[PDB]
């Protein structure tokens, strides 16, 4: 399921997507991927998983009062070790999506001191 | 309504931040991730940490970290605010309350470059 994207990522970024090896000690960064199409983000939730990248399920952003949004913007977070890895993850995922999922946007995110995942 | 207590607390403690009227900021550059293994508590925070200047997501789950000793899902939500100042304030207020009434809750300052992908008015 999503073999296509999975294999693409494993090839384009073998280290980041090595399903084998050891998680980083802390996840200081992430990429928020957002889109009005939850089905697409769900594809990403399935594909963007490894030892070095952990992704939340798809959820929703809150509506901003005083705008006329016609549609919920969904999102997920993909946690990675640091800023280097986040830049890379965003680059690779979006190169793909640019052709096959243009509804998808990515935003670099950072936590102090790091995201609250166990050690 | 429900959680009237926590709501009133937040608005008295930080009036501008939790003013239910006014104008949202133009961009939300920061947020606080509030997390906990208790989803019911985070549902409370979800209905409560809302205003014109603070917007919170529904409760979701963090992914499990391979090869660790928890076997307990950790839930979270994000509360978006204008910037680092407002995030520091929001975290302080919410956690002063929770420190007494919800010791399971943690707060983490988060920042987005250039800002979080919420629309603009």
Author numbering:
A (entry chain B): 142 to 260
B (entry chain A): 141 to 261
From the primary publication:
Latency-associated nuclear antigen (LANA) mediates γ2-herpesvirus genome persistence and regulates transcription. LANA mediates persistence of episomal DNA and thus is required for long-term maintenance of viral genomes in dividing cells, a role central to viral latency. The ORF73 from MHV-68 encodes a much smaller, 314 amino acid, 50 kDa nuclear protein (termed mLANA thereafter) which lacks the extensive internal acidic and glutamine-rich repeat region of kLANA. The C-terminal region of mLANA, comprising amino acid residues 140 to 263, has amino acid similarity to the kLANA DNA-binding domain.
The structure of the C-terminal domain of mLANA was determined at 2.2 Å resolution. The crystallized domain contained residues 140–272, designated mLANA140–272. The tertiary structure of mLANA140–272 exhibits an α+β ferredoxin-like fold which assembles to form a dimeric eight-stranded anti-parallel β-barrel that is central to its functional architecture. Each monomer contributes an anti-parallel 4-stranded β-sheet “half-barrel” from which helix α2 and α3 pack onto the plaited sheet with their axis parallel to the strands of the sheet. Size exclusion analysis confirms that mLANA140–272 is also a dimer in solution. In total, seven phosphates ions were located at the surface of mLANA. Five of these are situated on the ventral face while the remaining two cap the dorsal side of helix α1. Therefore, we consider the ventral face as the putative DNA binding site of mLANA. Electrostatic surface analysis of the mLANA protein reveals an extensive positive patch on the dorsal side which includes residues Arg-156, Lys-224, 225, 228, 229, 231, 251, 253, and Arg-232. The positive electrostatic surface also encompasses the identified 226QAKKLK231 motif that is involved in binding to BET proteins.
